[PDB]
Amino acid sequence: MTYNELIYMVLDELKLSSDDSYYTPDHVIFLLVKYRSFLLKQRYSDIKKQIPDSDYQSICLDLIEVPAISGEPCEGSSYLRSKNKVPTTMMIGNPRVYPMDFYQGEITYISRDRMRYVGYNKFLRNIIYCSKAPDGYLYFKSWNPQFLHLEKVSFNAIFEDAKEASEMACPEENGTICKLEDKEFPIEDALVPPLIELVVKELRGPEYSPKDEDNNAKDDLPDAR
């Protein structure tokens, strides 16, 4: 299913057909992305299960050589980093940075705490490491000067915000998809009934809840206006 089919099921389950309604598809897009990572963390964080291929998204990145701090000589070796910020991955699956071929390359996504201590082993010095700094950017690191020639990687993981990873999505064979709504929503099809139930339950009560109808310089909600 796409983004559109999941929006329009929750809208039709709530019967939110009218254009002059309080809850828009943007209330539904927000809650579907929030309840996706809520529900994936409820299933896949206590004990370790197989994660289906549906929960992952592959985003495309452009890498640029950035300094360590500034343009000074004694600061340390420079990194590569994504020019745009990357989404935050969930810690439930197999995140994987790969050089535009999933079946090839050893670029290792790790913790940010680990990446300040990497490559001191003599047998692990030609391996490129990845982490997301608190800048919001994906940084790259190895002791091999060759890693500073990467121009492009793809990042397959279960990101926390599914909407962020759909705007950074890889180009198709046909071309880019202009609307978020014609893009694939990233959840297993076995988790879509629990996802629709929780988003409908959150908006069902507030759907029939009263509003401050009158423009009279007064709060009319205690009167159930």
Partner: protein, 32 residues
Amino acid sequence: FGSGAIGYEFDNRYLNNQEMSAVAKQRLTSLP
């Protein structure tokens, strides 16, 4: 009314602790 993101996570956590008790009774026994 309705909102079920804390009823879900408490029910999901009770079934987790009940599952955790069930896997703590498992024994691969070691007599012949």
